[PDB]
């Protein structure tokens, strides 16, 4: 692999996801593929569909082979079923050759291909245990590590809030400055990591740390927002309201049913608090914090040319605390499967109007935190 | 999932071996299968991959024409037929699928009698 060649290999933005161009089959068909650290299947549109331009036609690839079974994936808010096959795939930027991988071609779906998306397949980069129909269906990244002789590590930078980069097989030094901090992967399915504390404007939420991990705290590039369990979400909304210099937001704003609008260049950014998430260091005596500024969670959206409107970048969850694109837009994130850890560095690209919109710092002591914040 | 390699040995330059990998605990007829090799002090080196129905095969340039991958789905076995062996081919050879690998089989190619 050539990591430098992978810089800027993603297109897209937060609300719509970040995608990689992949060439599938013989002769190659080019698809736009969502980079998803929250699932473990390589799956592409197999038919025309609303909201997509293009799909992979198996009949036009001479190297495609059908496994003779299908797969159905069900999420909380959507589903799809596809035929499972194998074919050769090329990633134009960082590699010299094609590779043989599993692929699901979607022939039916519910609430999966959405308005506004520019992708027509997904690349699940999570662990084998999440793969469907079972963990024996070799994942794309397991194929790539095995066939391309790369290290079992990839890293991602999202630059939309300021395209992006997906560096398969390592870390690209040009994508960060300052230090990389690593937190252990607690459980290898999703990228589940341990959250010790959330802090709003320097004020810790007063919750038992198990509240942050009971469902599971995961890092997921395929989720747009920062999703917080209801109790945690309520506490965050209360603290942001308390901390705003002048009250600006209705209840409808906090739930996503209203926009907050200001006349062009009147947004009082200095009014709103930083939000920090504390993660355990590999040395359990220490933690570090990843911090997002208001510009990352008070998110620009389309009132007409005279106003700038904004939607809240955090939402309630049912089943996980999801560190989605809202937060990943601030950091270079290293998914170090080989060493069972997730790394973070501030993204130099996460700057607006000459100011960083994220920070990372440490170390902090964990002596006043339970030794395990994942329920036991 | 269980993978078990066998068939390695100590051969002279220009010799041959047939490696086997016995698979169990999964549907072998639906698995992409791969051979990799690693010698002490060197990085892991991909050798060859075969799709599940056996029709698609890929090879490292370092082994192309000398090694041939094959499988017998009905017998849950992956093979590597290795001809024209060279000292540089000395390594532990492992068969892998879905992130799992067997314990490996040693191949040593040497003129040290
Ligand atoms: Cl497979």
**Alpha helices, H only, A211-305:** 230-243, 251-255, 294-297
Is the peptide bond prior to A12 cis by the omega test (within 30 degrees of 0)? no
- CA pair distance A374, A361, nearest whole angstrom: 23
- CA pair distance A23, A29, nearest whole angstrom: 5
Select A151-376's CATH number: 2.40.70.10, 3.40.50.1460, 2.60.40.10, 3.40.50.300.
Answer: 2.40.70.10
Task: Say if CB A142 and CB A128 are below 8 A apart.
Answer: yes
Q: How far apart are the first and last CA of chain A?
A: 41
Q: Residue A325: which H helix or E strand, with range? A: helix A325-328
Q: Are strands A307-312 and A298-301 parallel, antiparallel or unpaired?
A: antiparallel
Residue A36 appears among annotated catalytic residues: yes
Which regions of chain A carry the CATH code 2.40.70.10? 18-150, 151-376
CATH 2.40.70.10, domain A18-150, yes or no: yes
Task: Test B46 with A146 for CB contact under 8 angstroms.
Answer: yes
- CA pair distance B32, B54, nearest whole angstrom: 9
Q: Which residues in chain A are contacts of B37 at CB distance < 8 A?
A: none
- CA pair distance A20, A158, nearest whole angstrom: 12
Of B26, B32, B43, the CB nearest to A86: B32
Task: Say if CB B96 and CB A146 are below 8 A apart.
Answer: yes
- CA pair distance A200, B66, nearest whole angstrom: 63
* Distance (Å) from CA B52 to ligand 1 centroid: 7
What does residue A79 show for φ and ψ, rounded to 5 degrees? -160, 160
Resolution of the PDB structure in angstroms = 1.5
Is residue A309 helix, strand or coil? strand
Burial (Cβ within 10 Å: 0-12, 13-18, ≥19) of residue A231: middle
The residues spanned by each domain of chain B are: 1-113
Q: Most A CBs within 10 Å: which of B1, B21, B29, B32, as the mutation test of the A interface?
A: B32
Q: Are strands B105-109 and B91-97 parallel, antiparallel or unpaired?
A: antiparallel
Task: Test B55 with A65 for CB contact under 8 angstroms.
Answer: yes
Q: Which residues in chain B are contacts of A83 at CB distance < 8 A?
A: none
For B1-113, CATH number? 2.60.40.10
What is the CB neighbour count within 10 angstroms for residue A118?
Answer: 16
Length of chain A: 376
**DSSP structural state of residue A17:** E
Q: Most A CBs within 10 Å: which of B30, B54, B63, B100, as the mutation test of the A interface?
A: B30
- CA pair distance B82, A192, nearest whole angstrom: 43
CB proximity list for A74: less than 8 A, separation 6 or greater: none
Selected catalytic residue, list A13, A142, A215, A220: A220
- CA pair distance A143, A138, nearest whole angstrom: 7
Task: Test B49 with A67 for CB contact under 8 angstroms.
Answer: no
Q: Tell whether A137 lies on the interface with B, counting CB pairs under 8 A.
A: yes
- CA pair distance A41, A83, nearest whole angstrom: 12
Q: Give the per-residue SS3 of B31-47.
A: CCEEEEEECCCCCCEEE
């Amino acid at each position: 692999a050539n990591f430098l060649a992978m810089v800027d290999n993603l297109q897209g933005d937060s609300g719509r996801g970040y995608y990689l161009e992949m060439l599938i089959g013989t002769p190659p068909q080019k698809l736009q593929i969502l980079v998803d650290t929250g699932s473990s299947n390589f799956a592409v549109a197999g038919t025309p569909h609303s909201y997509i331009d293009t799909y992979f036609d198996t009949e036009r690839s001479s190297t495609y082979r059908s496994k003779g079974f299908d797969v159905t994936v069900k999420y909380t808010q959507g589903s799809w079923t596809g035929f499972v096959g194998e074919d050769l795939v090329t990633i134009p930027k960082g590699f010299n050759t094609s590779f043989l991988v599993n692929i699901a071609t979607i022939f039916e779906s519910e609430n999966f291909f959405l308005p506004g998306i520019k992708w027509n397949g997904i690349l699940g980069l999570a662990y084998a245990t999440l793969a469907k129909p079972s963990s024996s269906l070799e994942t794309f990244f397991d194929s790539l590590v095995t066939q391309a002789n790369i290290p079992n590590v990839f890293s991602m930078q999202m630059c939309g809030a300021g395209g992006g980069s997906l560096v398969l097989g390592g870390i690209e030094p040009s994508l960060y400055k300052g230090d990389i901090w690593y937190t252990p992967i607690k459980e290898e399915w999703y990228y589940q990591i341990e959250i010790l504390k959330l802090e709003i404007g320097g004020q810790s939420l007063n919750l038992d740390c198990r509240e942050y991990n009971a469902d599971k705290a995961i890092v997921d590039s395929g989720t747009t927002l920062l999703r917080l369990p209801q109790k945690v979400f309520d506490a965050v909304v209360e603290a942001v309201a308390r901390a705003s210099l002048i009250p600006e937001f209705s209840d409808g704003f906090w739930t996503g049913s209203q926009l907050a609008c200001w006349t062009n260049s009147e947004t009082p950014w200095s009014y709103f608090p930083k939000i920090s998430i504390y993660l355990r260091d590999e040395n359990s005596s220490r933690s570090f914090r990843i911090t997002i500024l208001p510009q990352l969670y008070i998110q620009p959206m389309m009132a007409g040319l005279n106003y700038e409107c904004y939607r809240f970048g955090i939402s309630p969850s049912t089943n996980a605390l999801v560190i989605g694109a809202t937060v990943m837009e601030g950091f270079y994130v290293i998914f170090d499967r080989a060493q069972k850890r997730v790394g973070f560095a501030a993204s130099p690209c996460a700057e607006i109007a000459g100011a960083a919109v994220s920070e990372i710092s440490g170390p902090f002591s964990t002596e006043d935190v339970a030794s395990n914040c994942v329920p036991a | 999932v269980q993978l078990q390699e066998s068939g390695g040995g100590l051969v002279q330059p220009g010799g041959s071996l047939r490696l086997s990998c016995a698979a169990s605990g999964f549907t072998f007829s639906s698995a992409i299968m791969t051979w990799v090799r690693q010698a002490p002090g060197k990085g892991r080196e991909w050798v060859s991959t075969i799709g599940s129905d056996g029709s698609i095969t890929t090879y490292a340039d370092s082994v192309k024409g000398r090694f041939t991958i094959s499988r017998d789905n009905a017998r849950n076995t992956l093979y590597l037929q290795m001809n024209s062996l060279k000292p540089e081919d000395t390594a532990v050879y492992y068969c892998t699928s879905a992130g799992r690998r067997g314990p490996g089989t040693q191949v040593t190619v040497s003129s040290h009698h």
